[PDB]
Structure formats: C-alpha cells, structure tokens
C-alpha cells in the first residue's frame, strides 16, 4: 500500500513541479525588471548624494570585467529602510 501510494505522490511531485517550470519564465522576467529597476534607483540616488566627494563618479565599477555580476543584496536592498531589509534577508529563514 505504501509503495503504490508513494509512486502516486511522485507523480504528484512532477505534476506540481511541471507547473513551476511553466511559471518560472514569468518570474525570471519579473525579478529581472525588479532587480534592475532598483539598481536604477540606486545610482539615481547616488548622483544626488555624492557630488562633493572629490572623484566619486556615479556608478563606478568594482569588478574590472565588463560582464554582468549578480548584484550583492547589500546594495540592492541596502539603501532602503530597515524594515524591508529585515523582512528580506532573514525573511525566508524566519517565516515559520
């Protein structure tokens, strides 16, 4: 009985996962715009705050390569408020 039920549950998993794979293309685009909207906000603020600092040009690279790098969250969400920082870093780890 357990063997038959377990095989049915495996078929349930691939049924559940198949939905996720169809869902992922929309989420990838949503996160892509969300993350790049925020970095656009980040250096947009950077121009206003940092102009008196003598050679702090806005949006200086840190990596010598010109290839895109997964942005560190410390600058994505970092300039934001304290609350959304807390709900993001230890958000999945803490939600229970």
């Amino acid at each position: 009985s357990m063997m038959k039920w377990n095989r049915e549950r495996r078929r349930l998993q691939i049924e559940d996962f198949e939905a996720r794979i169809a869902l992922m293309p929309l989420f990838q685009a949503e996160k892509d715009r969300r993350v790049l909207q925020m970095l656009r906000e980040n250096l947009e603020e950077e121009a206003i705050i940092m102009k008196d600092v003598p050679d702090w040009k806005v949006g200086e690279s840190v990596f010598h390569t010109t290839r895109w790098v997964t942005p560190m969250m410390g600058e994505l969400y970092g300039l934001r408020t304290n609350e959304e920082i807390l709900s993001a870093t230890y958000g999945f780890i803490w939600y229970t």
Partner: protein
C-alpha cells in the same frame, strides 16, 4: 495574534500535566482494585488543583552542600524543553513549520539529559551522584536507537518535515509497514520517558529519588512536569509517527479528535505498563539495547533504506 497562540499551547498542557496526575494514580489503582483519588471533588477531579497548589506552597529546602545556581537551572530546563517539544507538532497545523522538526525534536530530547546531569551533581549526595550516573547514561544510550528508528521510518516518509507525516500516512498506518520498528520505538521511549520497567532513573523502592533528586517544592514542581509533559509528548510523537490519522483541509477538527484520542490511548498504555510490569535492572537495561535492540535496529534500518529502492518507492518530499 502570535502571543495568544503560544499561550493557547502552553496553558492546556500545564493544565493537562497537573490533571494527568489524577488519572495516572486512578487508572493505576483501577488495575490494582482501587478507586484512585475520588474523595476531593467530583470523582477526585480536584486533586490536580490540590498538588499544583501544594508543591508551590511547600518550602523548598536547598541542599547544604550545593550551588543554588545549578539547583535552580536544572529544574527549569528540565521542563522548558518539554513545553518546547509541542512547538513543531503537526496537530492539523503545527505552530512552527520547521522543515527539520524531527531533528529539532531530537535535539531538545538530548538536551533533557543535561537537566538530569547537574541536578544529580548539584545536590552533591551519594544517591544524587549515582542516581544521576545511571539516569543520564541510560537515556543517552537509548537515544542512539531513537535516532536510527526515525532514520528508518521517515525514509519512506521523506524529509524530517513533521507536516509531511500526514501526507504519507494517508491510506494505511505506518505501523502496518514497520511494526517491528513500532515495538522498537515504543519501548525505547520508555527509558527516555523515565517511565515503566526502565525506571532505574529514579528507582522507587531502592534509590529514593533519581533524576528528580531531592529537589523539592519549587524545583520538584517543574521537575515533576519535566518528564510528565514529556510523556504526553512522546505519546504524541508516536501517535503522529505510526498511528496517524486523516486531515480534511475543510475540516481540521477530525484530525485533532483522532490525534488526541490516540495520544491519550498511548498515555494510558504508559500507565498500563507503569505498575503492571516489574522493574528492569541497569545491567540488563544496557544489555537489552547494545546486544539485542542495536543489532536488530541496524538491520531493520538496512532493510528500510533498500526497500524504497527495491520497489522504486522513494518519497517525493524534495
């Protein structure tokens, strides 16, 4: 409203644990041709209140040769984990949905031996030192079989997510698949519970007091609740592991009714064994596991890992 939910989980068990002393002595008496407490209130229903209002007014006497820091902390963490055990229990919807609840549950179960350790040491008595010595060693020695039994059991279930237990156990009880593990699991608790024949932790008639030591009044109270709330816990842990139930999403009431009855039945069986059987001996206490339980548990675990691959019945948990 999280704080009320925690209180709604802490209040009932304390009210249960005090009120479980009533049925324990009374059910014991009824399998001893007695009536149990029945003169204080309707059918004795007030004794739980009496003892809960007596060990809290008895003056606690600290031992002369003792450090009161250990003499106080040892009772506290003896009970505090027993209430924390109920945090990840999947009563329809568990309070905390720890994806590794079972390991978390075993972690605090291992923390219980520490309350055995300093409590025996701090009192600094010949009974206290030896009483601790046998008690903690027995509990840790039977924890290794506890770890293996789960490893065999949830291997068919999936990961250690206690919420998944209802999903896998949905057509037959898991005991019907691993009943040799069931007796392995149920009896192995009887020592960690400090319950029946594995009673050498305290030794009623020959060691006066063991795990609890002489800790009286205050320290006694939550030491009494320490391995009393725990009894309701690993009664419930077995009642969710093997003797599962059904869970309708639109009616979680049925799951609770089935869960409480099976847990209550297991608690009565604990009391059933409490006085019916004689008491083991510590040499035999270790003889039983390391020479009979451990070799048999190892093979059964070996059977329970191969079997899902024998029939392609590996779980979809991940």
């Amino acid at each position: 409203m999280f704080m009320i939910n925690i209180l709604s989980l802490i209040i009932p068990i304390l009210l249960a644990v005090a009120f479980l002393t009533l049925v324990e002595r009374k059910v014991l008496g009824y399998m001893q041709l007695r009536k149990g407490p029945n003169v204080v209130g309707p059918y004795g229903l007030l004794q739980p209140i009496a003892d809960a209002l007596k060990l809290v007014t008895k003056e606690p006497l600290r031992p002369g040769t003792s450090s009161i820091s250990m003499f106080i902390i040892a009772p506290i963490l003896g009970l505090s984990l027993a209430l924390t055990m109920w945090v990840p229990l999947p009563m329809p919807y568990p309070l905390i949905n720890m994806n590794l609840g079972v390991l978390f549950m075993l972690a605090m179960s291992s923390l219980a031996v520490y309350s055995i350790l300093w409590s025996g040491w701090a009192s600094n008595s010949k009974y206290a030192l030896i009483g601790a010595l046998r008690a903690v060693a027995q509990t840790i020695s039977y924890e290794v079989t506890l770890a293996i039994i789960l490893l065999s059991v949830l291997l068919m279930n999936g990961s250690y997510t206690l919420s998944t237990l209802i999903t896998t156990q949905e057509h037959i009880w898991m005991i019907f698949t691993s009943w040799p593990l069931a007796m392995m699991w149920f009896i192995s608790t009887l020592a960690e519970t400090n319950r029946a024949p594995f009673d050498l932790t305290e030794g009623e008639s020959e060691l006066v007091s063991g795990f609890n030591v002489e800790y009286a009044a205050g320290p006694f109270a939550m030491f009494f609740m320490a391995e009393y709330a725990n009894i309701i816990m690993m009664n419930a842990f077995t009642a969710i592991l093997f003797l599962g139930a059904s869970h309708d999403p639109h009616t979680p009431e049925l799951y609770t009714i089935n869960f409480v009855l099976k847990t209550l039945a297991l608690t009565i069986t604990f009391l059933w064994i409490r006085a019916s059987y004689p008491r083991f001996r510590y040499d035999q206490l270790m003889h039983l596991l390391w020479k009979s339980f451990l070799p048999l548990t190892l093979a059964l675990c070996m059977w329970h890992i191969s079997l899902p691959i024998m029939t392609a019945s590996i779980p979809p948990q991940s």
